[PDB]
Structures are given as C-alpha cells and as structure tokens.
Amino acid sequence: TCPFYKKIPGTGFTVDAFQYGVVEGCTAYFLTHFHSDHYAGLSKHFTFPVYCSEITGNLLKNKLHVQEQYIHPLPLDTECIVNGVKVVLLDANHCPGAVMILFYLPNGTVILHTGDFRADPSMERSLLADQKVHMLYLDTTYCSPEYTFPSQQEVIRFAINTAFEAVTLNPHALVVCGTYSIGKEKVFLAIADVLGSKVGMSQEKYKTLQCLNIPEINSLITTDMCSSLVHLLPMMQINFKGLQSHLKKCGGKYNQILAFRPTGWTHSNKFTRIADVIPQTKGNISIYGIPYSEHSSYLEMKRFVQWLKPQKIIPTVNVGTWKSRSTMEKYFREWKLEAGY
Ligand code: NI
C-alpha cells in the first residue's frame, strides 16, 4: 500500500509509486528519475500513463521495455495540462533526466515535489520565482549539519589532476571508474577528456549512456576496451581482488591501476579537506574514494528552503524512525524562526 507522502491531494496523481500494484484512484503516475528505489515496479506489462522527462522516457523504453503508447515525455520549463491540471517540470540537478514537479491544484494550492535534488542558487531564477508554494515535498537525504562535502567542480578538479599526474609519470597505467546507476558521468567523462581517450565499458552500460542525450556522445565512449585507457566497471568490482582480476584480462598492456569510487558522503568528510584525500594502496593498485554528491548539502538545502518559504514541508527521505522525523522537524522550525516566515 502506497504511503501518504507519495500522493498529491486533490488530484488523480502519484509520484514515484510503481511498487504497490494498481493504486486506487490514480489516473497518472509521475516518475521523477531513473533510479531503482524510485522506478521499483515498472516493466513491459505496465498499462497506465507515465509522465516524465524525455531522457527518463528513453530509459523506460530501451532499458525496461515499457511500450511507447504508455510513455508521456514533457519538456522542461513549460506549462503543460495533464488530466485537466497545470504542471511544470524543472531540472533537479541530480542525475540525467531528473526533475522536480510543480503542481497547480484546482483549488488554488501550489505544491513542489523535489524528487531527488541537489539545491542550487540558480533555482531561485527558474519559474519558481513567480509565485507562492503552499506544500514542499522535500529530498531530506542530508538534512543534518554534519553532512558537509565540496562542490562538484572541486571534486572534478581533484580527479582530473590526480589522473593526469599519474598517467604522465607512468604511460602504462590504466584508469578505472566504478558505476552502479546513472548519475555522476562527469567523473569518467572529465578524466577521459584530459587523457585523450574514449571511455571503455560493457555493452549494457553503453546502451544506458546512449539514452541520455549527451552531446557528441559517439565521440566520447566505446565498447572496444582495447582502444581505451579509461575503463568503467561495476562498483562491486572496485576492490583489490576485482581490480587484479581486471588487469590480468588486459593482455600485459598495463602495469598499474589507478581507480576511482565515487561515493556519497562518508565520515572522512568530518575531518579531511578534498586536497588532503589519500588512496588505499596494495602493490601496483590504488583506489580513491571521492565525495561526488548529487544530493543537497545541509547548507544548500537550508538556503533553498529559506528562499522558497513554504507553508508546510513533507520530507521524503529518512522518514522511517521517530528520532529522524523529530530531528528534521527541529531544523525546519529553526529555519522558519531565523528567516521570519
Ligand atoms: Ni536518486
């Protein structure tokens, strides 16, 4: 049974609700982004209308085989009427194709559902500037002040400099980057660009990247692993055993691996600067964990919410324990008292 924070009152609509069977009264199912916790349930057998971005629609069709007749892609930044209700999709600054959804209810209430997002000041100059929001359904993944991490641009600067230095000292080093979902593509794309290489990967991952509308993608990626000195591997293989096993397969072309594991936040963020990050090393293999986040920091979240001034906030993450829910409610009340709304 579908929880309350996935229903949109006063409409026939749900958000990210595909794992509960047929939801009573749902005439349109919105999908914010192609991450498995959110799409859990969709397949070729789905026969209700799905509303989403163009990129999410390409993934639904090619990766999950949803039939074309049930896929309803909408452009971004454009007022659209769905089942007699005005909606807008906005870029969420999460993974490719990820959106926030603004719903203009028949009674006059305006609701914003963030999906998963990484808040940014550029959002203060979208179509959100123009009017009031009564209800915010908020991605609270990192809603506590201990969650700190750098900008994505600082993290990419560290990875490019680290890779370029290593392969210039040793032309026979291979670079490996872990993946398990869409998102964070700038990590392997930026590194391959500085090294003058295409990125090598499996047929399955190539297919997924081909759905993403990335400009000049055919110039950037390949399934021919031998021609490439940046390889992608599933995240589970990013360990000393998995990497040794991979280097054997490369036919004595390489004598060293440098690997990157993009993570979310980790508690080494509470002491160390990005500059001071060091790898784990065994022999000719070194592994860097780098804190490249596609969710808001505490400070980014607080700025967004204090600017938007919603009348009510409904969290969508960390909602399963009394202590988590209580902690989030405390911060929402500080923010409101500090800013005066
Ligand atoms: Ni996500």
Short mmCIF file of C-alpha atoms and ligand atoms in Angstrom, two decimals:
data_model
loop_
_atom_site.label_atom_id
_atom_site.label_comp_id
_atom_site.label_asym_id
_atom_site.label_seq_id
_atom_site.Cartn_x
_atom_site.Cartn_y
_atom_site.Cartn_z
CA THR A 1 0.00 0.00 0.00
CA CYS A 2 1.09 3.48 -1.20
CA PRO A 3 2.31 5.89 1.56
CA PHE A 4 0.88 9.42 2.08
CA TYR A 5 3.99 11.36 1.13
CA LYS A 6 3.69 9.83 -2.46
CA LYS A 7 0.17 11.04 -3.04
CA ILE A 8 -0.82 14.50 -4.38
CA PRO A 9 -4.08 15.58 -2.68
CA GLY A 10 -6.84 16.87 -4.89
CA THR A 11 -5.59 15.08 -7.97
CA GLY A 12 -5.57 11.67 -9.55
CA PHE A 13 -1.73 11.71 -9.30
CA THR A 14 1.12 9.78 -7.64
CA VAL A 15 4.88 10.36 -7.64
CA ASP A 16 7.48 7.53 -7.69
CA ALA A 17 4.79 4.94 -6.75
CA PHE A 18 5.18 1.85 -9.01
CA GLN A 19 5.79 -0.91 -6.34
CA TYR A 20 2.29 -1.02 -4.86
CA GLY A 21 0.29 -2.53 -7.79
CA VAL A 22 -2.75 -0.57 -9.08
CA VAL A 23 -3.14 2.49 -6.76
CA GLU A 24 -6.85 3.24 -6.13
CA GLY A 25 -7.84 6.42 -7.91
CA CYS A 26 -4.55 7.00 -9.79
CA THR A 27 -5.10 8.29 -13.35
CA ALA A 28 -1.42 9.38 -13.93
CA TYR A 29 1.86 8.04 -12.46
CA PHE A 30 4.77 10.54 -12.42
CA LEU A 31 8.37 9.32 -12.39
CA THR A 32 10.94 11.93 -11.17
CA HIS A 33 14.08 9.99 -12.34
CA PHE A 34 15.51 6.63 -13.43
CA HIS A 35 16.94 5.39 -10.04
CA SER A 36 15.79 1.89 -8.92
CA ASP A 37 14.34 2.81 -5.47
CA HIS A 38 12.01 5.22 -7.44
CA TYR A 39 11.08 3.15 -10.54
CA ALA A 40 10.67 -0.14 -8.43
CA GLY A 41 7.79 -1.92 -10.26
CA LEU A 42 7.72 -0.74 -13.90
CA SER A 43 8.11 -3.26 -16.87
CA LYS A 44 6.80 -4.10 -20.44
CA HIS A 45 3.49 -5.14 -18.81
CA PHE A 46 2.66 -1.67 -17.37
CA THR A 47 -0.52 -0.25 -18.98
CA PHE A 48 -1.12 3.13 -17.14
CA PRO A 49 0.07 6.59 -18.33
CA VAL A 50 3.62 7.50 -17.15
CA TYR A 51 4.69 11.15 -17.10
CA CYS A 52 8.39 12.04 -17.07
CA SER A 53 11.24 13.76 -18.84
CA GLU A 54 12.44 12.88 -22.43
CA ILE A 55 15.60 11.24 -21.01
CA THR A 56 13.65 9.16 -18.43
CA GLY A 57 11.29 8.15 -21.27
CA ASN A 58 14.26 6.91 -23.42
CA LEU A 59 15.38 4.74 -20.43
CA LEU A 60 11.85 3.35 -19.76
CA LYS A 61 11.52 2.31 -23.44
CA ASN A 62 15.04 0.82 -24.03
CA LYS A 63 16.06 -0.48 -20.63
CA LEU A 64 12.71 -1.59 -19.05
CA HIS A 65 10.76 -2.11 -22.44
CA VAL A 66 7.73 -0.06 -21.45
CA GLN A 67 5.52 0.30 -24.51
CA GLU A 68 5.65 3.58 -26.40
CA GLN A 69 1.88 4.12 -26.02
CA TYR A 70 2.17 4.49 -22.22
CA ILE A 71 5.22 6.90 -22.22
CA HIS A 72 4.37 10.59 -21.93
CA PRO A 73 7.52 12.77 -22.09
CA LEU A 74 7.19 16.51 -21.19
CA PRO A 75 9.58 19.31 -21.99
CA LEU A 76 11.14 21.25 -19.13
CA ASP A 77 10.33 24.83 -18.11
CA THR A 78 6.94 24.67 -19.89
CA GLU A 79 3.36 24.93 -18.55
CA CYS A 80 1.56 21.66 -19.53
CA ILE A 81 -2.01 20.44 -18.81
CA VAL A 82 -2.29 16.84 -17.62
CA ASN A 83 -5.76 15.37 -16.93
CA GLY A 84 -7.04 18.96 -16.52
CA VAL A 85 -4.29 20.09 -14.06
CA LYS A 86 -1.43 22.55 -14.89
CA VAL A 87 2.07 21.08 -14.18
CA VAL A 88 5.67 22.19 -14.85
CA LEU A 89 8.86 20.05 -14.84
CA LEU A 90 12.08 21.66 -13.60
CA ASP A 91 15.71 20.43 -13.70
CA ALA A 92 16.55 18.81 -10.32
CA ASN A 93 20.37 19.00 -10.64
CA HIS A 94 20.52 15.23 -9.73
CA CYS A 95 21.23 12.61 -12.48
CA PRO A 96 20.42 12.86 -16.21
CA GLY A 97 16.70 13.28 -16.82
CA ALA A 98 15.87 14.05 -13.12
CA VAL A 99 13.09 16.59 -12.49
CA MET A 100 11.13 18.43 -9.79
CA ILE A 101 7.38 18.73 -10.47
CA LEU A 102 5.25 21.89 -9.77
CA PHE A 103 1.52 21.12 -9.47
CA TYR A 104 -1.09 23.93 -9.71
CA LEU A 105 -4.13 22.33 -7.90
CA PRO A 106 -7.72 23.15 -8.98
CA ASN A 107 -8.40 24.76 -5.53
CA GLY A 108 -5.52 27.36 -5.80
CA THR A 109 -2.83 25.47 -3.72
CA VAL A 110 0.62 25.15 -5.40
CA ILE A 111 2.77 22.05 -4.50
CA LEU A 112 6.52 21.44 -5.36
CA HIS A 113 7.82 17.84 -5.26
CA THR A 114 11.65 17.98 -5.45
CA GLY A 115 12.18 14.29 -6.30
CA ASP A 116 15.86 13.78 -5.58
CA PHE A 117 17.76 17.12 -5.99
CA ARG A 118 20.97 19.00 -5.33
CA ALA A 119 19.75 22.55 -4.45
CA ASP A 120 21.45 25.41 -6.20
CA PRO A 121 21.11 29.23 -6.22
CA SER A 122 20.31 29.03 -9.99
CA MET A 123 16.92 27.53 -8.94
CA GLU A 124 15.98 30.90 -7.43
CA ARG A 125 15.75 32.11 -11.18
CA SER A 126 13.59 29.40 -12.58
CA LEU A 127 9.74 29.53 -12.87
CA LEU A 128 9.77 29.13 -9.04
CA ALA A 129 10.46 32.87 -8.66
CA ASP A 130 6.96 33.90 -9.89
CA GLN A 131 4.65 32.56 -7.11
CA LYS A 132 4.00 31.10 -3.73
CA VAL A 133 4.33 27.37 -2.72
CA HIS A 134 1.95 26.02 -0.05
CA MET A 135 3.46 22.44 0.25
CA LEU A 136 7.11 21.26 -0.35
CA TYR A 137 7.75 17.50 -0.63
CA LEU A 138 11.50 17.64 0.11
CA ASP A 139 14.57 15.38 -0.55
CA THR A 140 15.95 15.35 3.04
CA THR A 141 18.78 12.78 2.37
CA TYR A 142 21.41 15.02 4.09
CA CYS A 143 19.27 17.11 6.42
CA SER A 144 21.75 17.44 9.38
CA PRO A 145 24.64 19.86 9.82
CA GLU A 146 27.31 17.15 9.92
CA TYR A 147 26.67 16.49 6.27
CA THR A 148 29.27 18.55 4.51
CA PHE A 149 31.07 17.89 1.19
CA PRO A 150 32.69 20.05 -1.56
CA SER A 151 31.25 21.42 -4.83
CA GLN A 152 31.11 19.00 -7.80
CA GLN A 153 33.57 21.35 -9.66
CA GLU A 154 36.22 20.98 -6.81
CA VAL A 155 35.82 17.21 -6.80
CA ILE A 156 36.25 17.03 -10.62
CA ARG A 157 39.35 19.30 -10.40
CA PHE A 158 40.90 16.79 -7.88
CA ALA A 159 40.11 13.74 -10.04
CA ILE A 160 41.44 15.32 -13.36
CA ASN A 161 44.72 16.50 -11.67
CA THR A 162 45.23 13.13 -9.91
CA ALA A 163 44.69 11.07 -13.12
CA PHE A 164 46.76 13.34 -15.42
CA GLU A 165 49.68 13.35 -12.96
CA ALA A 166 49.65 9.53 -12.59
CA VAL A 167 49.48 8.62 -16.28
CA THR A 168 52.11 11.32 -17.21
CA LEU A 169 54.53 9.72 -14.67
CA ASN A 170 53.55 6.23 -15.93
CA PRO A 171 52.17 5.97 -19.53
CA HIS A 172 51.46 2.31 -18.78
CA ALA A 173 48.88 3.00 -16.01
CA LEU A 174 45.14 2.20 -16.58
CA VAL A 175 42.40 4.33 -15.01
CA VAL A 176 39.24 2.56 -13.73
CA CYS A 177 35.98 4.31 -12.52
CA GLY A 178 33.13 2.46 -10.63
CA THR A 179 29.42 2.87 -11.51
CA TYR A 180 26.08 1.24 -10.44
CA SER A 181 23.36 3.53 -11.69
CA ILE A 182 23.04 6.63 -13.91
CA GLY A 183 24.45 9.82 -12.47
CA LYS A 184 28.00 11.16 -11.80
CA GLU A 185 29.02 10.68 -15.50
CA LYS A 186 31.20 13.90 -15.30
CA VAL A 187 33.77 11.87 -13.16
CA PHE A 188 34.72 9.38 -16.00
CA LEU A 189 33.99 11.87 -18.82
CA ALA A 190 36.33 14.59 -17.43
CA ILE A 191 39.17 12.14 -16.72
CA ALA A 192 38.97 10.55 -20.25
CA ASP A 193 38.94 14.08 -21.82
CA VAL A 194 42.21 15.16 -20.05
CA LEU A 195 43.89 11.82 -21.08
CA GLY A 196 42.75 12.00 -24.75
CA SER A 197 40.88 8.73 -24.54
CA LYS A 198 37.37 7.37 -25.09
CA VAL A 199 35.78 5.63 -22.13
CA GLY A 200 35.55 1.85 -22.44
CA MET A 201 32.62 -0.17 -20.98
CA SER A 202 30.27 -3.18 -21.29
CA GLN A 203 27.54 -3.34 -23.90
CA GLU A 204 24.85 -2.94 -21.13
CA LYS A 205 26.40 0.33 -19.83
CA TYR A 206 26.96 1.69 -23.34
CA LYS A 207 23.26 1.16 -24.05
CA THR A 208 22.30 3.11 -20.94
CA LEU A 209 24.59 6.06 -21.84
CA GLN A 210 23.17 6.12 -25.37
CA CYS A 211 19.73 7.03 -23.84
CA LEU A 212 20.98 10.22 -22.15
CA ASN A 213 21.08 13.00 -24.84
CA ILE A 214 24.70 13.86 -24.05
CA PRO A 215 26.11 15.99 -26.92
CA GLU A 216 28.74 14.32 -29.11
CA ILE A 217 28.49 11.07 -27.05
CA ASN A 218 29.69 8.92 -30.02
CA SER A 219 32.99 10.83 -29.79
CA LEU A 220 33.32 10.06 -26.02
CA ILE A 221 32.52 6.35 -25.30
CA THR A 222 33.12 2.89 -26.77
CA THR A 223 32.66 -0.87 -26.25
CA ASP A 224 36.19 -1.61 -27.58
CA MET A 225 38.08 -1.92 -24.31
CA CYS A 226 41.48 -2.34 -26.00
CA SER A 227 41.36 1.08 -27.64
CA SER A 228 40.57 2.84 -24.28
CA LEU A 229 42.72 3.72 -21.20
CA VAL A 230 39.75 4.76 -19.02
CA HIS A 231 37.54 1.72 -18.19
CA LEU A 232 34.17 1.60 -16.38
CA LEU A 233 33.37 -1.32 -14.15
CA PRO A 234 30.52 -2.16 -11.85
CA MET A 235 31.03 -0.59 -8.39
CA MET A 236 31.27 -4.03 -6.73
CA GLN A 237 34.41 -4.84 -8.65
CA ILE A 238 36.18 -1.68 -7.23
CA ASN A 239 38.42 -3.56 -4.72
CA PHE A 240 41.90 -5.14 -4.78
CA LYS A 241 40.61 -8.60 -5.92
CA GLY A 242 38.31 -7.25 -8.62
CA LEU A 243 40.94 -4.90 -9.99
CA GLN A 244 43.74 -7.57 -10.06
CA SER A 245 41.36 -9.77 -11.95
CA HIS A 246 40.59 -6.98 -14.41
CA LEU A 247 44.40 -6.19 -15.03
CA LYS A 248 45.00 -9.87 -15.96
CA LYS A 249 42.39 -9.50 -18.76
CA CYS A 250 44.26 -6.57 -20.40
CA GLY A 251 46.99 -8.71 -22.07
CA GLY A 252 50.06 -7.09 -20.43
CA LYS A 253 49.18 -3.66 -21.83
CA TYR A 254 49.23 -2.11 -18.37
CA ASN A 255 51.34 -2.49 -15.19
CA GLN A 256 49.41 -0.25 -12.73
CA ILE A 257 45.71 0.67 -11.97
CA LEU A 258 44.51 3.91 -10.56
CA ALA A 259 40.74 3.56 -9.61
CA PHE A 260 38.02 5.97 -8.50
CA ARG A 261 34.96 5.08 -6.31
CA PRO A 262 32.50 7.88 -6.36
CA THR A 263 30.59 7.69 -3.09
CA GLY A 264 28.00 9.86 -1.41
CA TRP A 265 29.00 11.41 1.93
CA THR A 266 31.33 9.37 4.20
CA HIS A 267 32.52 10.34 7.79
CA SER A 268 36.08 11.05 6.47
CA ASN A 269 34.28 14.34 5.30
CA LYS A 270 34.14 15.43 9.00
CA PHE A 271 37.97 15.90 9.24
CA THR A 272 39.66 15.97 5.83
CA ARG A 273 39.81 18.59 3.03
CA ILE A 274 39.36 17.34 -0.57
CA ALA A 275 43.02 18.38 -1.23
CA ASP A 276 44.29 16.06 1.54
CA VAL A 277 42.50 12.88 0.30
CA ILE A 278 44.71 9.78 0.04
CA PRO A 279 44.16 6.38 -1.55
CA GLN A 280 44.15 2.80 -0.37
CA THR A 281 47.11 1.01 -1.98
CA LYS A 282 48.14 -2.63 -2.49
CA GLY A 283 51.14 -3.10 -4.75
CA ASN A 284 50.54 -1.65 -8.24
CA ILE A 285 46.77 -0.82 -7.35
CA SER A 286 45.49 2.38 -5.77
CA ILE A 287 41.80 3.25 -5.01
CA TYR A 288 40.48 6.77 -4.27
CA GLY A 289 37.06 7.32 -2.72
CA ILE A 290 35.82 10.72 -3.85
CA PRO A 291 32.70 12.51 -2.31
CA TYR A 292 30.86 13.48 -5.51
CA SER A 293 27.24 14.14 -4.33
CA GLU A 294 24.08 14.52 -6.42
CA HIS A 295 22.03 15.47 -3.27
CA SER A 296 21.93 18.82 -1.42
CA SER A 297 24.38 19.50 1.49
CA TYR A 298 22.71 20.68 4.69
CA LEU A 299 23.69 24.31 3.90
CA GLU A 300 22.44 24.13 0.25
CA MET A 301 19.06 22.66 1.45
CA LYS A 302 18.63 25.29 4.15
CA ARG A 303 19.33 28.12 1.67
CA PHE A 304 16.78 26.83 -0.80
CA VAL A 305 14.04 26.31 1.75
CA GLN A 306 14.61 29.72 3.49
CA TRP A 307 14.30 31.34 0.00
CA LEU A 308 11.19 29.41 -1.09
CA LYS A 309 9.35 29.95 2.28
CA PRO A 310 6.89 27.10 2.01
CA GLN A 311 3.91 26.95 4.29
CA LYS A 312 4.36 23.24 5.09
CA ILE A 313 7.28 20.75 4.50
CA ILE A 314 6.78 16.95 3.98
CA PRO A 315 10.10 15.01 4.00
CA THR A 316 10.52 12.16 1.52
CA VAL A 317 13.84 10.63 2.93
CA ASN A 318 14.79 9.41 6.45
CA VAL A 319 11.11 9.09 7.35
CA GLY A 320 11.21 5.61 8.96
CA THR A 321 12.34 6.38 12.59
CA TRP A 322 10.85 8.65 15.23
CA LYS A 323 14.28 10.14 16.00
CA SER A 324 14.92 11.01 12.29
CA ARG A 325 11.50 12.62 11.89
CA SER A 326 11.92 14.65 15.12
CA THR A 327 15.41 15.85 14.19
CA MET A 328 14.18 17.08 10.72
CA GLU A 329 11.15 18.92 12.27
CA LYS A 330 13.52 20.77 14.63
CA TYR A 331 15.65 22.08 11.81
CA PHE A 332 12.57 23.17 9.77
CA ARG A 333 11.44 25.26 12.84
CA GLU A 334 14.85 26.86 13.32
CA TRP A 335 14.95 27.79 9.65
CA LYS A 336 11.48 29.34 9.81
CA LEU A 337 12.27 31.34 13.05
CA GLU A 338 15.61 32.58 11.70
CA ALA A 339 14.19 33.83 8.34
CA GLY A 340 10.76 35.04 9.70
CA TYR A 341 8.20 33.15 7.55
NI NI B 1 18.15 9.36 -6.98
#
